[PDB]
């Protein structure tokens, strides 16, 4: 009963919702039509829907991660081996319940995460993730000595947007180009990066440039930070230094031109290794080193 349309429906919304959360909700809604009782009629349909979504996907792995998590949850659900109605009801409940959860997670974050701020520490923020922004705003709320540094990101002018968002807060800020980020090593005390997908080992999928930043941090011995909630978990491991399922160009040397038509071709999404990250920020208590892998193991058991 459609899912692509639902996905499309969320573009100018957000800020209050959460794309992957929305997707999950949509999935749940789809599920509560074709009966969760008959497993043959339902699971296959769900799979088909997921395939369709993948086909319609441009540059996103997080939705897939969400859907597989949902599937896993569903599978777990039927372990009670009792009546087939209560379980169904629970499943039905668990969609808006997921939406509700996000708020609670945020709340949890905003009380433990505020302990990290030290006296006169300058913070650089990279990537458009809602969680990081929330953390920042709720740190301002707490009233702690802090500074904000903006990086000039170029997918569809994201850095500028981030800067603008920061402005409507009242915090003094300065914009730095992604090429010029290397020179800033002593002034910025902590390097903060948001994530779009957390892998097996603890590797991060995000945006236009993260790996380089990580490398720089390693070189300067400055702490590297990953800020996320709890829905972006993929059972994946990259083969090379940077490899992802992409709809865009993986390094394309364009043919001989004069009038300029196609030139903007290359890497858009980047992967960073486990060694670079020193601290991980999540709502599930406090966990850092290799907890994601453990979580995955718990989930899949395979």
């Amino acid at each position: 009963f459609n899912i692509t349309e639902t996905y499309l429906r969320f573009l100018e919304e957000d800020t209050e919702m959460t794309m992957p959360i929305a997707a999950i909700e949509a999935l749940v809604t789809l599920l509560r039509i074709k009966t969760p009782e008959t497993a043959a009629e339902m699971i296959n349909t769900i799979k088909s829907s997921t395939e369709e979504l993948i086909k319609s996907i441009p540059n996103s792995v997080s939705l897939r991660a969400g859907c597989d998590i949902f599937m896993r949850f569903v599978l777990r659900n039927l372990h009670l081996y009792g009546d087939w109605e209560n379980c169904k009801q629970h499943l039905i409940e668990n969609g808006q319940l997921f939406v509700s959860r996000a708020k609670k997670s945020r709340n949890k974050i905003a009380e433990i995460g505020v302990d990290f701020i030290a006296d006169d520490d300058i913070i650089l923020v990279h990537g458009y993730s809602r969680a990081v922004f929330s953390l920042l705003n709720h740190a301002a709320n707490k009233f702690i000595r802090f500074r904000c540094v903006v990086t000039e990101s170029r997918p569809s002018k994201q850095g500028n947007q981030l800067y603008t968002l920061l402005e409507q807060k009242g915090i003094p800020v300065t914009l730095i180009v992604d090429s010029a980020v290397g020179a800033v090593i002593d002034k910025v005390d902590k390097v903060f990066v948001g994530a779009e997908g957390v892998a097996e080992s603890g590797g991060i999928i995000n945006l236009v440039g993260t790996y380089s930043v990580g490398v720089l941090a390693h070189n300067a011995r400055k702490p590297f930070y990953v800020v996320t909630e709890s829905h972006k978990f993929v059972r994946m491991f990259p083969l090379s230094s940077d490899d992802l399922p992409m709809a865009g160009p993986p390094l394309d040397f364009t043919r001989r031109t004069d009038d300029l038509e196609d030139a903007l071709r290359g890497p858009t999404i980047d992967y960073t290794a486990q060694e670079y990250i020193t601290a991980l920020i999540t709502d599930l208590g406090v966990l850092t080193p290799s907890a994601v892998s453990e979580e995955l193991i718990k989930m899949w058991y395979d």
Partner: protein
């Protein structure tokens, strides 16, 4: 060795602080955003106290209220507070007489004049006092002394010149001078009553006042006997030296570590500064003594309590402490 009572000489040095001490009591005033009595109490506890006695006269009701509000009022305390209420304005002799009249004095009682906060362990001192007492029958009281900052220059009110022995640690002469403040008496006096008995004469000036006394049961009786001694340092010690009662010994304990009593304003400031730094070994605000306190430690000797708000872009120097519930703006040095 165990079971020792404490008597604290409070509300004694009023009008010495010339602007203040008129509406509220002297000791109730905060040292570092927290009352001065508390530190003294802590020190007493560290030493070994089983009962607390305070001398109040000037604004006693407020003191009583404070006591009622304080932590030691509740039954968990090893020492209970019972205040001595006396008629207005009297010297330390009169107070002693009053105490004697009441009669709680047993064994080795602790008498502390003013408010003192120091880092040195007291058990060892107590042991020393006991051992020395065990030597001869006619031993009186203990005095506390610490090594000064090489040369004396900021000391004008009480620059006492202590002529001391190394073998027995006993005072020979006590004298006060206005020498650095006013050039009228740059002077030294030595008496010949104890020259041909001590032999080892060491003349010193660089020693700071503490005014913490461990006293035997003889002292109040002595005070009762000789009513001419109104003070305890200037007339009393000298009298003891010049053989008022023949064949008697007094103590002067020497310690390399920091020990200074509260006396004036500049001195108070210096004490506060010392407290802020790491001069006193265990005495830090971040440990939280009053239980309502929520102090925490930060880099470069900076103290910050909980609910402290400070705005962005303010360059700070060295050694700063901020109390709870503060709102500070921008562009401050």
């Amino acid at each position: 060795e165990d079971r020792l009572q404490a008597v604290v000489l409070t509300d004694s040095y009023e009008t010495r602080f010339m602007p203040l001490t008129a509406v509220k009591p002297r000791c109730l005033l905060p040292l570092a955003n927290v009352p001065l009595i508390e530190y003294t109490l802590e020190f007493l506890a560290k030493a070994g106290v089983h009962e607390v006695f305070l001398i109040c006269s000037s604004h006693a009701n407020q003191i009583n209220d404070y006591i009622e509000n304080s932590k030691w009022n509740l039954p968990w305390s090893p020492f209970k507070i019972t205040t001595i209420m006396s008629p207005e304005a009297r010297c330390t002799g009169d107070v002693m007489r009053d105490l004697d009249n009441r009669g709680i004095i047993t064994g080795d009682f602790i008498l502390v004049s003013g408010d003192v906060l120091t880092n040195i362990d007291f058990s060892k001192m107590l042991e020393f006092h006991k051992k020395m007492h065990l030597q001869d029958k006619d031993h009186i009281s203990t005095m506390c002394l610490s090594k000064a900052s090489t040369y004396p220059k900021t000391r004008t009110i009480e620059p006492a010149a202590f002529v001391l022995d190394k073998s027995t640690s006993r005072c020979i002469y006590y004298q006060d001078l206005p020498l650095p403040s006013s050039r009228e008496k740059t002077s030294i006096q030595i008496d010949p009553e104890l020259l041909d008995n001590v032999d080892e004469f060491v003349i010193r000036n660089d020693l700071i006042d503490c005014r913490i006394d461990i006293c035997t049961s003889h002292v109040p009786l002595i005070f009762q006997e000789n009513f001419d001694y109104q003070s305890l340092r200037t007339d009393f010690v000298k009298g003891v030296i010049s053989s008022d009662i023949l064949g008697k010994h007094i103590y002067a304990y020497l310690t390399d570590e920091y020990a200074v009593r509260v006396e004036s304003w500049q001195t108070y400031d210096t004490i506060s500064q010392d407290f802020l730094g790491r001069w006193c070994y265990p005495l830090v605000l971040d440990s939280n003594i009053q239980d309502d306190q929520t102090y925490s430690y930060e880099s470069r000797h900076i103290y910050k309590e909980k609910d402290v708000v400070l705005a962005q872009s303010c360059k700070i120097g060295k050694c700063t402490a901020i109390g709870s519930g503060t709102k500070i703006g921008e562009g401050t040095k």
